[PDB]
């Protein structure tokens, strides 16, 4: 049952972390969707790596799955947009507005319009709701605090936020047991026994 195969993925995650293959760890987290790594998420948000942030999230929830996950994406894309305005790249800002933020217009027509009109301001802090924003470093941090709460309350993350606690190198330990079980079905071995590979079962002679 997957209640097993799922555990195996966690063992592999631990192995990967111990061998320090960092990028592989998070791709496996993402593609399996078994464990959401906050520490990693925060790190990418602070770095403003938005493409990776959305890619990583997409392993866990889609934009419209529920109100929590919908605010999560909305907050992320909003910040993406504001930073584009702040670096005065209006071509990119409109691209974000059309590709990323349009999905939210259907249920908030008015908000989308309000966000659109930020394009025409000298500085979006002229908007009274945004009057408090500085600086990119600080805005991200404030937003992140919000994101953590949203994720922690989101039902779709509910069993995914705490890594199981295991002895070191559990997968290596299990593998070693398989060699013991292989050998304990053997014939007349000395207590050597010479193990050639993990790829095919061991035997003593031949």
């Amino acid at each position: 049952m997957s209640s097993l195969s799922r555990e195996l993925v966690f063992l592999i995650l631990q192995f990967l972390d111990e061998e320090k293959f960092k990028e592989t760890v998070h791709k496996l987290e993402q593609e399996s969707g078994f464990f959401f790594n906050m520490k990693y998420f925060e790190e990418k948000v602070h770095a403003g790596e938005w493409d990776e942030v959305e890619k990583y999230l997409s392993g866990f929830t889609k934009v419209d799955d529920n109100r929590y996950s919908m605010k999560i994406f909305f907050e992320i894309r909003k910040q993406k947009y504001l930073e584009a305005l702040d670096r005065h790249d209006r071509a990119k800002a409109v691209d974000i507005l059309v590709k990323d933020l349009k999905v939210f217009s259907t249920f908030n027509e008015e908000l989308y319009k309000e966000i659109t009109q930020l394009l025409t301001l000298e500085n979006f802090r002229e908007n009274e709701q945004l009057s408090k924003y500085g600086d990119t470093k600080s805005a991200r941090s404030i937003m992140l605090i919000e994101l953590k709460k949203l994720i922690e309350a989101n039902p779709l993350f509910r069993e995914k936020l705490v890594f199981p606690t295991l002895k070191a190198s559990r997968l290596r330990t299990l593998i070693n047991q398989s060699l013991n079980w292989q050998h304990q079905l053997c014939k007349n071995p000395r207590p050597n026994p010479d193990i050639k590979t993990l790829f095919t079962d061991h035997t003593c002679t031949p």
């Binding site: 109100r67 929590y68 605010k71 908000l111 709701q129 919000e146 949203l150 309350a153």
Partner: peptide, 9 residues
């Protein structure tokens, strides 16, 4: 409870 799940600026 308190997290506001509503979208705005």
């Amino acid at each position: 409870s308190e997290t506001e799940l509503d979208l705005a600026l």
